[PDB]
C-alpha cells in the first residue's frame, strides 16, 4: 500500500510508519486494498465469502469455519500477520517491516508518537509525522483524527 493506492470500497489512512486501507461501513479487507461485504454466519450458503479482515468462510461430519488467509493468524478474534503475534506496541499497531527481507513485526505509531528507542521501539516517544496522503478531491485535504491521517472535507 502506497500513497498511489486506491482502496476499493475503503479509504487510505496513515500512521507513523505505514499506510493501510480502512474499509467503509462494515465491510472487511479481502486483500490489502479491497473491501467486500462480510457474512455474519459461516455455513454452506456463505462458503468462500469474507467473514473478517483477511479471513473467509471455508469448508473443513461437514462443517464451515472462519479461517485466516495464509500468512495470518487468529489472535484475539482478529487475523494479524504471523510475525506480529507476540508484539505489543502501545500507542499504535504492529506491522511487518518492509525494509526487512525477513518478515518481522515492528511498531507503527498513532500520529504524534514515534518508535521509542528508549522503550524497545514501542510507540511511546512524542514525535511528528508529515502527512503524505494524496487527497484527490479538490474539497478534501489530509486531516488528523484519532491517531491517524485520512482525507476529509476542508
Amino acid at each position, epitope marked *: 500500500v502506497t500513497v498511489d493506492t486506491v482502496c476499493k470500497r475503503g479509504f487510505l489512512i496513515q500512521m507513523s510508519g505505514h499506510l493501510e486501507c480502512k474499509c467503509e461501513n462494515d465491510l472487511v479487507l479481502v486483500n490489502e486494498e479491497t473491501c467486500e461485504e462480510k457474512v455474519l454466519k459461516c455455513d454452506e450458503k456463505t462458503v468462500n465469502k469474507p467473514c473478517g479482515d483477511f479471513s473467509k468462510c471455508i469448508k473443513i461430519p461437514v462443517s464451515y469455519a472462519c479461517k485466516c488467509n495464509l500468512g495470518y493468524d487468529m489472535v484475539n478474534n482478529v487475523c494479524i500477520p504471523n510475525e506480529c503475534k507476540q508484539v505489543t506496541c502501545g500507542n499504535g499497531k504492529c506491522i511487518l517491516d518492509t525494509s526487512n527481507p525477513v518478515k518481522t513485526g515492528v511498531c507503527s505509531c498513532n500520529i504524534g508518537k514515534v518508535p521509542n528507542v528508549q522503550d524497545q521501539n514501542k510507540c511511546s516517544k512524542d514525535g511528528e509525522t508529515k502527512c503524505s496522503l494524496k487527497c484527490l478531491k479538490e474539497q478534501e485535504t489530509c486531516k488528523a483524527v484519532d491517531g*491517524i491521517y485520512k482525507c476529509d472535507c476542508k
Partner: antibody
Amino acid sequence: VQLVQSGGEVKKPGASVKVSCKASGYTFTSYGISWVRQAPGQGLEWMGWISAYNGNRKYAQKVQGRVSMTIDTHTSTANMELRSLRSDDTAVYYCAKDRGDGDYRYYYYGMDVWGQGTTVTVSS
Amino acid sequence: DVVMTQSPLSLPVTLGQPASISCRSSQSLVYSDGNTYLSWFQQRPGQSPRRLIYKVSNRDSGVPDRFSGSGSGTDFTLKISRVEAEDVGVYYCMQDTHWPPTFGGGTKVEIKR
C-alpha cells in the same frame, strides 16, 4: 496532557448550568470529549459525547432532551450545558478525552485523560 | 443498554497480597471488528478517575506492572499482584463496544483488619 474544568456551581431547579473543559498538551481538534457524571456516593454515568474534529454529538437517553454540547476550537474548549435542572442532577461532572471519529475505529481508545471534575448542586 | 456488574462491592485487602475484581457484561463485548472494548479505571479518594487498562488487557503508560486485566466475551478480571497502600479507592470497568458506553457499579478496595 490535561483537561481543566470550570469551577463548582449551585443552581435552582429549572435553571441551566454550563460546564467548560479546556484541553492542553494534545491536539484537541483531532479528538472528542465525553461527559460523565457521578452523583454523591454513586457510580459513574455517561452523559454524551461531542467530536472536536467534526462537531458530531450523541447524548445519553436520560438527558438527551435537555443537554447541549458545543466546541470552541479557538480556545480548545468543550462545553456542556444541562437545562431544566432538577435535584437529581446534583453530581460531579467530568469531561474525558475521547474519539474524534464516531463512525470508524482506528487504534486509539478513548477516556484516556480526565478533567478534575465540576460539582453541580441543584436545590431550591 | 449493556449492564456491567462488578463483584465484590467492597474488597478488603492485605498490603502485599494479591487481589482481583470481577466485571461481567449482560452481552458480549466483542465488537463487529473482532475487538473487545473493555476498560478499567481507578478512582482514588477525592480524585478523578484514571484509566488503568484498555482493550481488556493493555496497561496505560505509567501504570505499574502489578495491575493486569484479562477475560473475554462477557467475563473480565482486574488483578493486582501485590496491593500497595496507594491502591485503595474505587475501581470501575467500562464497555464501549455497544452504545451507550456504560460503567460497572464500582468496587471499593479497603484495608483488611
